[PDB]
Design a binder for these strands. Sequence first.
RNA 1: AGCACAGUCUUAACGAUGGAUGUCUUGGUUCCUACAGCGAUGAAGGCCGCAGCAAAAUGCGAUACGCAAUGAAAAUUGCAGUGACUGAAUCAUCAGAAUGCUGAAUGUAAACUACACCAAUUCCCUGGGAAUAGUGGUACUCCUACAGAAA
RNA 2: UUACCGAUACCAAGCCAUAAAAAGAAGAAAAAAUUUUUUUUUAGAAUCUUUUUAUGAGUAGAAAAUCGUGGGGUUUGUGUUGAAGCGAAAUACGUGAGUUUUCGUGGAACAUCUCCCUAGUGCAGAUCUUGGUGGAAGUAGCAACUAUUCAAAUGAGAACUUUGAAGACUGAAGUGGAGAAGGGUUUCUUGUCAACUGUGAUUGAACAAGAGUUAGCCGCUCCUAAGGGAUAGCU
RNA 3: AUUUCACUCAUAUUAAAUAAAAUAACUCCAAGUGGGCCAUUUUUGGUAAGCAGAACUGGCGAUGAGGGAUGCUCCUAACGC
RNA 4: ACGGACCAAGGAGUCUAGCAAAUGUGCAAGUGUAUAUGAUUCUUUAAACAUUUUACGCAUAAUUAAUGUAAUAUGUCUAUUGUAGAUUUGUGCCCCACUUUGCAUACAAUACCGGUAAGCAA
RNA 5: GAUGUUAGGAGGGCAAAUCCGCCGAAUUUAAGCAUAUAAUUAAGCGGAAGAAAAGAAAAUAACUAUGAUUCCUUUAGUAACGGCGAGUGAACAAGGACCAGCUCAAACGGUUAAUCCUUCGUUUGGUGCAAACCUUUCGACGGAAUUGUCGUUGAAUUAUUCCAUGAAUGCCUUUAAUUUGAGCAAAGUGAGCAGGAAUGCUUCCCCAUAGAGGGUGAAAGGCCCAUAGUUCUUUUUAAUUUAUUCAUUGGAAUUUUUCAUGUCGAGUCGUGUUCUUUGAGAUUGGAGCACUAAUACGUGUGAUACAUUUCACAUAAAGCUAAAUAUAUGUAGGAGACCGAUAGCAAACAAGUACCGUGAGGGAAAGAUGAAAUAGUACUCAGGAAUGAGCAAUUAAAUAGUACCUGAAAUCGUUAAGAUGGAACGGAUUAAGAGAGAAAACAAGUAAAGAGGGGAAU
Lengths: 211, 121, 154, 147
Amino acid sequence: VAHNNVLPNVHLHKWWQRHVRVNFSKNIKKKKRRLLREKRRKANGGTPIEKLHPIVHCPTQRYNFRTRLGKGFTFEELKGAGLTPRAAQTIGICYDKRRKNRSEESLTKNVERLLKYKNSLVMIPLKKNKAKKGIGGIPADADKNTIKEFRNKKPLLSIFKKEKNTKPFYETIEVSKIDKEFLAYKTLRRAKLAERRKNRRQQKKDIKFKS
Amino acid sequence: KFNKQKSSSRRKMRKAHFTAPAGLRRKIMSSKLSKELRLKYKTRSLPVRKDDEVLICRGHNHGREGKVVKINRKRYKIYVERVTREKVNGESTFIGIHPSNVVLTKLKVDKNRKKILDRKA
Amino acid sequence: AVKLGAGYETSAESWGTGRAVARIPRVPGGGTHRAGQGAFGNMCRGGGMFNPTKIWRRWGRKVNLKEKRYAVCSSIAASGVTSLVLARGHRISHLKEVPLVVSNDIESLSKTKEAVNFLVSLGLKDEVNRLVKSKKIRAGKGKMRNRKYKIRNG
Amino acid sequence: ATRFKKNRKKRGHVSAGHGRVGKHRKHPGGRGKAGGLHHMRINFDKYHPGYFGKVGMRHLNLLKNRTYCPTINVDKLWGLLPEEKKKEFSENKDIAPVIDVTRKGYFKVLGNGKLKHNQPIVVKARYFSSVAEKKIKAVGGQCILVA
RNA sequence: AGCACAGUCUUAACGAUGGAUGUCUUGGUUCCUACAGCGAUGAAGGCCGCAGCAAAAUGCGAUACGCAAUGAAAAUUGCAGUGACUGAAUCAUCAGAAUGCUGAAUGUAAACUACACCAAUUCCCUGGGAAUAGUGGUACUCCUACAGAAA
RNA sequence: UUACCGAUACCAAGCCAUAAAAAGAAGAAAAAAUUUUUUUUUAGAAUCUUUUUAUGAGUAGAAAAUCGUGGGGUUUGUGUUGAAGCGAAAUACGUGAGUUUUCGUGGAACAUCUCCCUAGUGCAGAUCUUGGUGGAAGUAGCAACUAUUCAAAUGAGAACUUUGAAGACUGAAGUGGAGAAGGGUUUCUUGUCAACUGUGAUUGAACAAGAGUUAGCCGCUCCUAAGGGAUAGCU
RNA sequence: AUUUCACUCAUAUUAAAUAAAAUAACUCCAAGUGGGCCAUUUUUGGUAAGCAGAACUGGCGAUGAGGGAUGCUCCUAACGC
RNA sequence: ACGGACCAAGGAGUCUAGCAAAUGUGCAAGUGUAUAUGAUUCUUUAAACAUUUUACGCAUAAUUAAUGUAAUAUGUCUAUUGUAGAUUUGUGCCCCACUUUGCAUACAAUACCGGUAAGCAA
RNA sequence: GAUGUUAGGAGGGCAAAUCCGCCGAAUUUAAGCAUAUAAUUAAGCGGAAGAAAAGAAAAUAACUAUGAUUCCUUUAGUAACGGCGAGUGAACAAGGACCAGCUCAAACGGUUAAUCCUUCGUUUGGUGCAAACCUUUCGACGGAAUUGUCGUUGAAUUAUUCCAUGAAUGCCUUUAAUUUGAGCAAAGUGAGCAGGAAUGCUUCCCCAUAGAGGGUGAAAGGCCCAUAGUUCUUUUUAAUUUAUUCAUUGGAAUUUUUCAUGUCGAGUCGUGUUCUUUGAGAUUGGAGCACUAAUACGUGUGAUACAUUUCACAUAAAGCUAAAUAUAUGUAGGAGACCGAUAGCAAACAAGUACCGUGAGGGAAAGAUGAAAUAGUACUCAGGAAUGAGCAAUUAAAUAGUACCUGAAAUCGUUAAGAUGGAACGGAUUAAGAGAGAAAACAAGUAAAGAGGGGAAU
């Protein structure tokens, strides 16, 4: 090496020619997987190809505030929406037996999401003009004139799309209503200093409760 | 053009033309037909055959006409009755004429052709 | 790009001191006159190019979106100056005003005969005349690579 | 781009700009960072002082999400809210803005800068600096702890 | 009708040798797209054959440069000869028929066209005449059933 | 003691380039004929125009400005009334890489300097690669195996094809008959000479067309040997 | 010692002379080079060397031109036509 | 001293990754639409166009092995202090000395942040 | 157990680009070299598919928490590893593509093996000319299975629906999409010039939802194939004629009362040691050996060994699974700022060919007449013939004659001119010859006659 350069660390000491790939077929396959889902949406017959997903909170303190689409609604969310998981998988509802509702907010954010989705079901007959009542907590089905006048309307996809979240970053307060006596830095330092002994106390709480 | 299924490559089309099987060569044998013939048969072009009557309109003998006597799809040529040429050895041969340089004037009918006219109709 | 190992599909025999020949690799064997010839090398017949072309060349470029829309806006603005469009090569000496706007019934009609008629009556007869006879076979090896013609832009 | 290359401008110069006596051999001093402490030592000591050796403990697996903490200084606090509202907020002395920097993506509020004198402001942040709190509460404001 | 010295070197014009240059390109290369295996129902590969005149390549298999069938549609032609005046000449498709000896090769062998064993086999008509030294089967391992023997 | 000769150094002048500087974003001059015509010019591009002064070696090395090639967009051209290329050239231009023309040949494409884009882009060398060709040079050389001669035939042509005569050789361990391995049609007849047969050649193991190998007894096939492969196992 | 106010020490030839002294100063990036040799003067080792090793300056290298018949280094003199 | 008998054609600082410097360009405390997504774009189309009101990279803050801590400081929308210094203001639209302003930058001085010492330390 | 020339079947081999196991280097870098790196790579052995493999937590996290696997962006050249040298190097969260989940292992049928297979017969109807194929079910026989198949995923008890039919009757019409094969498909063969021959040049017209390409005696939108565009046909897949009853025959799924709080993978986990592997460091995974568990209150992770203990997460030692992903292979399409016969694959051609090596293997060179050889050289003369020549002959052309487009240089021949005492060439300056040359290297205008070309004049 020479002059004032960063010391090199290029990890090209193996046979790297075989491991090079260039994505010439990026937009081609983007078009191809567009056409595949267009064909899928044409074929299934007006039923949306998207599936409903829960609004879920991102883990860790880095993404604590954000929400996204989780995998599957929980058993108690579906039961509070009045659906068994088995009967919910067939109407475009995702279910996972791994998530647990750890909060009232987590429950009652997904419960009315499930009910809003349930407020848009339109079942279809199966047995050649023998529309019937259904099974399992799925809504009912309609008749010939309804099937001739319903199938040709505009579908809704915003509900499938992740719920838009408006959060008021900006807000005002009356000046008389501020707590001028607070000491946030001292509070933080006190909490950090007192963390150990409070953990001790919690441990002793658990030991006592094991009685 | 707009059909991406078929190629516009120079080498691909040249190879196809120069190695076309005789069944496809007989369609390249096609030639225009005269105005009166076009009015009668409602079409614009037809392939040729050993007993059609034609009028050549391009080349050193662009005025002659007559009954073609033989076509060979290998050399992409047709031969009309009285355009014979003398060879060096001293005996007569036929001048090959490309079908695209002639216009049909009459057609012959046979047991074969009595339905070629029906299909072309 | 060239074939990956083009010119290197042989045996490296460089017995090259005492043989009174250059130290370049030689093809082994006998019976052929290929035998003993200079093997793979930048200089040898059938030896392989100096830096074989590779598909991982920087074929494309990432252009700033904001710069791209700047350029598009700038070209739109340049199209509105009579001098600039005249300078590019268009024969517009007879048309009235350079930001040429026509009524929406241009879209409703779909015959190129009246398309050319409208173009001519708008004052671009010389422009279409330039375009129609600008067509001719190009020079060079490009015309055996599906690139036969070279046409002016109208 | 090849026509602008420097090698093109010495096409008939024998040595191609690499010298007649020194020549252009392949790796005359080693490969990569070979000569550190031995014959590259002057370069290493002149341009990368603390390169050799090791200092400190080991954090075996990091999980940088655990300590991720963007910061904002107090002088940028009034820049977050729009100009019209700050304009209408500086007039009325009965109201103060509550700014939750966590929404804008800031976790700790640092104290560099100068806040406007006698302008109350309330800041909600995950962490607060001592100087930041002192500046905020010196202008009649308050720091609110959130998580 | 006569004149140049010879050789060596230089220049020009025209030629010889040679195959550069230019122009051609039924080829290559790279990328994108799509489909994806074959084989004891005998694969891939290898031999040997097959055309009127026929070496190679290509094609094919004792029906052997092609059969049948289907679509187009009448020549094959180097000579010969064969073809309608459309299952006929030639293309294309190719599903039916056929597919020599080998080769995992599998009866034993193998620089053998060598040697076995069991049904002697196959064809004719729908019980009587022939071809004949001439057809199929017989590996090793394993699975499911079955068998008659055993401690 | 004089005079003279004598540099690419010195002095005066001209021109090129480099560097620096002074300055700059629209009006009639002359001549030749005979008031009227004619002739030239009548300018304004900022990496530009005008003018001034000084200076100019150069390896390794660096930079700028230029000159070319394959291909791509843009513009706008040449081609059967002959393009590219090639040979010789030019009162041609540049300082120079080069550029542009003429004649001949050529017989189908070729440029773009308007501006830019791109690269497998420029050769005297690398005992460079491939191909072609020289002086050496009508030279070295066509030297083992004792040896040939006369006449005739064939043939366009005979020292080396055939026949006859002679002189000789191989000489009992043979250029003799059968021999295996290896070869594979070299065998035979007929024809034949483009190349080969290191001279000739009508010859030939060359070339071309046909033909030719007949087994109960000769061998293989059978047996077992040095040994090989495989089976059961076992790894 | 620092600071602020006053006074004022050639500055209209310049706190001595001379000066194609700003062709300066500084920053960044980077090439090549890192075998040297010769001449005058000085000098160490050596009998000495066109020997080995050093100091100053100038050259050869990297450079031609006129002269020394001849000559990489001597003298004159360095180079656009 | 080595290579070069002759001629033709071929013949060697290139491509990618990553970093920096330089310069041009756009935007600017931001900047880059990553993968992806949509669109009567879909010879030419593998490019162009676009992104229902916090993805990530780099920058915006440093310092410490590290629990961590983190930049004048509320007297005020004056925004550290000097010495030179570009530009500006006037008085003796174009020469000069004084005032006026004091960019960039250079040399210093100051505060303040992280770490380490030293003193105190509920 | 053995054995079947018993009946019915499977495996073997080829092929590899992507894919799955094993085995396993060294060159190289460290400017030496030994750990390290190369590299968990090359070579070697074995095994599959159109994808494979992974995959439904003994998982992360520490948060307001996420929820199978795979892949892309990023985390990130980061945590970490390392003669802490050279070098090496993840994971979580985040944004996306895609997105389906499931069953074996115990309970109950034990007032009925309720399950499975083999064989042989009948028939429920059908698309197909046929061949064959889809459906069809009464069985019976022979077995397998109790050393455990299937019914059951709890059981029984109340409260609503789903799934099939047998029979009879009428009933296979119509839109979009997608897709195979077929046809249809505009406008000049107009003057004139020069041509051997227009597709060229002038000029008169036209068609374009066709001005992509190819062919045609030269450069063609209008000469031919085709191309725009349309019209039928074919695979299925969204919308679409027609259902009516009758009947018991069960089955299933949704929801109240009690039990029973069950089961949950053993030479396995784990630990020690050794080797390897990893970023994994008082050991990341794997393997060999030794020891060898607990039973859900268990045991396994929470990246530093240990003891005591909280908390969180998951529920190992059994199995299946489509998508997004990859494809230097084969085949078939389409393209390119790629190469243009010393280039491009080794191979544009009779190329993995001829040829070389005992063999493993090595491995070329070689394209172009002309528009047309359905114009490939007729005839004569001289020669044995090859050949040559012509007063003869094809062609536009034979100095395009098959070693044939053009036809450079090296090298050689013929003619002409010049030079020539042991090199030749050359620099600078002229002179003498020999070639070419008029664009500055004199004569604009003027008047006359001869041929033309234009502009302004009705």
